Amino acid sequence: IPAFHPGELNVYSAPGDVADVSRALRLTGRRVMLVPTMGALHEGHLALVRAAKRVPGSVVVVSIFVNPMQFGAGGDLDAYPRTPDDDLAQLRAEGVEIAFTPTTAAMYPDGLRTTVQPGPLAAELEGGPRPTHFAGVLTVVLKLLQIVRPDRVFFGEKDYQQLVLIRQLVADFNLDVAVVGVPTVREADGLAMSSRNRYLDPAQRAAAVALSAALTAAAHAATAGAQAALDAARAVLDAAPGVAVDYLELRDIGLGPMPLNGSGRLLVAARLGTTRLLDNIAIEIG
Amino acid sequence: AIPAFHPGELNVYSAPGDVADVSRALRLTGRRVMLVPTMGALHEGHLALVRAAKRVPGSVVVVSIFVNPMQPRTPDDDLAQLRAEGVEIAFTPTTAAMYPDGLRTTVQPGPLAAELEGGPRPTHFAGVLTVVLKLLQIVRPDRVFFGEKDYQQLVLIRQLVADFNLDVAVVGVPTVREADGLAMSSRNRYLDPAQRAAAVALSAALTAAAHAATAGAQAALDAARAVLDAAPGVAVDYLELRDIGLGPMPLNGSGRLLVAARLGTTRLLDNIAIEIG
């Protein structure tokens, strides 16, 4: 067990160090909360931290790891924003006690060997043109869960398909952790927080409001049914200069092999220049 | 409320949540939870695993019995054997309890799973690693026990544990053998007398190789092949010398020699430690 200074930010890179500290804390009555991130922290991540913090007796572990396995060749891994100094400053300001910042070598000493194979949902929506993406996500999340052994793990609803797949991982492998989904944090005009928003120029930033405007329009149109909801969203997206829609889909809340009933999720993905944005919203039909 | 647990008796649980809750409660009382995963039809090979688990100070032994569809059924007989060994927990789930959402998220093994046994059964080890991962998460044992007879399985399990950062010790237990050397297996009873006599060639080949090895790796392999070549009706699927982790054998040092063969319709496996020179 390495040093743990209470009420200060303790940064650990070695998986064994955080595993030892987490174990010791749990054995003294603290409940360990995990917030897995890839850094480049914004107010949406801080909402996750605050949700974790409010669990009574909580000690909060925020992991920061740009996981190479969830990227494909072609520039994306190198292009992911890295703002380590801002990240840790924000964690300190939020009163987080543990940051876990592992190296690639510590997480993947044997390269890709045993991995997690997601169910068929991973081949759809975000996974359609990225068939190995969610395998990378679920593999790293499984590993973080085994290293840290938290009581609860926190994910944002912005990456809704990812959240659903993590619930699948937890159920399917009998993991003893509660998955907590936290609502998307938005800019004042509705834009969902994302580390990718920094790649919107002022014109693209203005146009990007169409995603949340389309979704909220759809949610209210939905008293008139699914077609009305989808057509309302499509109309808003069609009115938006330089928004290129990749998909707009209304599914059952679990995104799985069941038809839409009274409760759904409307998901959109769109490109503004080279920047791919996602958003989603709860839909009640009728 | 924690399910009833009666110390010193065989407590049988079919619900994953029940054994999870009892295991957690027991570990908090100062027991060390030992897991022995099986598919039932227990024989002396399984009992050696049980005895290895029992001897750990503070042990409570959980034997799982689950025929994993993803990778003989005598439930009353199996349970009687466990009771006689002083096992306090048997975990006997249904397929629907283990797979309430069907096959969905699974474990993808590394490339070793396509080799050796994975030749004829290319999805076998994915099934094994998936169910073992689930059992480890349900039971959360301190140590998990596997026989060395299924050596490739054992090595893949060790890969699983390392790769997913699992907090469990994997214990390999030496193969239990019949008086003539035949590795114990539920399959042995299917052999007719001619096949049962010829079947000794697997263990005889391996032990010959282990002693021939002072003369080097080729001498070891050639001695084993000669013994197999002296047996009728033994169709060898493979005979391979590998390092202990089943990578390529180094020039000198420790390795493992593995054999598999078909006798009529019955497939037999065996393996042995080899020290080169």
* DSSP letter string, B154-175: HHHHHHHHHHTT---EEEEEPP
Question: Torsion over CA of A157, A158, A162 and A165, rounded to 10 degrees?
Answer: 30
Cα angle B274-B158-A148, degrees, rounded to a multiple of 5: 155
A65 C-beta neighbours (distance < 10 Å), count: 19
Residues of chain A with Cβ-Cβ distance to B108 below 8 Å are 114-117, 135
Which 8-state DSSP code applies to residue A8? S
Given 3-state DSSP classes, what are the helix, strand and coil percentages for chain B, each rounded to the nearest 5?
A: 40, 25, 35
Residue A185 labelled as part of a binding site: yes
Residue B56 exposed, middle or buried by CB count within 10 Å (0-12, 13-18, 19+): middle
Residue closest to B245 by CA, chosen among B145, B142, B157, B124? B157
CA-to-CA dists, residue A101 to A65, A112, A154, A162, angstroms: 6, 20, 17, 21
What are the phi and psi torsion angles at B261 (to 5°)? Answer: -150, 155
Residue closest to A109 by CA, chosen among A15, A175, A40? A15
CA-to-CA dists, residue B178 to B48, B183, B185, B203, B229, angstroms: 13, 6, 10, 10, 22
Which 8-state DSSP code applies to residue B74? -
Beta strands in chain A (DSSP E): 10-12, 31-37, 58-64, 98-100, 115-117, 152-156, 178-182, 244-252, 263-272, 275-284
For an interface test with A, the pick among B106, B136, B142, B165 (most A C-beta atoms closer than 10 Å) comes out as B165
Cα–Cα distance measured from residue B53 to residue B136, given in angstroms and rounded to the nearest whole number: 15
The answer to whether the beta carbons of residues A155 and A183 sit under 8 Å apart is no
The answer to whether the beta carbons of residues B72 and B98 sit under 8 Å apart is no
Q: Which two tokens stand for residue A213?
A: 């405007």
Residue A189 labelled as part of a binding site: no
Q: Do B140 and A168 touch (CB under 8 A)?
A: no
A198 C-beta neighbours (distance < 10 Å), count: 12
CA–CA min distance A35, chain B (Å):
18
Q: Which two tokens stand for residue B154?
A: 């054992």
Cα–Cα distance measured from residue A238 to residue A217, given in angstroms and rounded to the nearest whole number: 13
The answer to whether the beta carbons of residues B256 and B241 sit under 8 Å apart is yes
Residue closest to B126 by CA, chosen among B151, B157, B97? B157
B6 is catalytic: no
Half-sphere exposure of B106 (CA within 13 A, CB side): 17
Radius of gyration of chain A (CA): 19
Per-residue exposure over B244-266, b if at least 16 CB sit within 10 Å of its own CB, e if not? eebeebeeeeebbbbbbbebeeb
CA-to-CA dists, residue B158 to A218, B154, B174, angstroms: 51, 6, 16
Cα angle A220-A221-A226, degrees, rounded to a multiple of 5: 120
Residue with tokens 């993905």: A269
CA-to-CA dists, residue A165 to A35, A255, A261, B100, angstroms: 16, 9, 20, 16
Packing angle, helices A84-93 and A43-53, rounded to 10: 40
Of A114, A120, A175, the CB nearest to B107: A114
Identify the experimental approach. Answer: X-ray
Residues of chain A with Cβ-Cβ distance to B105 below 8 Å are 116-119, 138, 168-169, 171-173
For an interface test with B, the pick among A34, A115, A174 (most B C-beta atoms closer than 10 Å) comes out as A174
Q: Do B137 and A175 touch (CB under 8 A)?
A: yes
Domains and CATH numbers, chain B: 1-174 (3.40.50.620), 175-277 (3.30.1300.10)
Per-residue exposure over A165-178, b if at least 16 CB sit within 10 Å of its own CB, e if not? bbebbbebbbbebe
What are the phi and psi torsion angles at B149 (to 5°)? Answer: -60, -40
Residue with tokens 């049988």: B12
Q: Which two tokens stand for residue B204?
A: 């005889």
What are the phi and psi torsion angles at A33 (to 5°)? Answer: -110, 135
Residue closest to B156 by CA, chosen among B202, B115, B184? B115
Cα–Cα distance measured from residue B202 to residue B225, given in angstroms and rounded to the nearest whole number: 10
A115: three-class secondary structure by DSSP: strand
CA–CA min distance B98, chain A (Å):
9
A124 C-beta neighbours (distance < 10 Å), count: 15
Size of chain B in residues: 277
B118: three-class secondary structure by DSSP: helix
Residue B87 exposed, middle or buried by CB count within 10 Å (0-12, 13-18, 19+): buried
Residue closest to B71 by CA, chosen among B111, B90, B34, B99? B99
Q: Who's near A210: CB < 8 A, 6+ residues apart?
A: A236, A237, A239, A240, A243, A270
Cα–Cα distance measured from residue A141 to residue B40, given in angstroms and rounded to the nearest whole number: 33
Q: Which two tokens stand for residue A150?
A: 């938290």
Residue closest to B66 by CA, chosen among A165, A169, A174? A174
Residue closest to A272 by CA, chosen among A216, A214, A212, A201? A201
Q: What is the resolution of this structure in A?
A: 1.5
From its phi and psi, is residue B11 left (phi > 0), alpha (psi between -120 and 50) or beta? beta
Measured in whole angstroms, the distance separating CA B200 from the mean position of its chain's CA atoms is 20
What are the phi and psi torsion angles at A261 (to 5°)? Answer: -110, -120
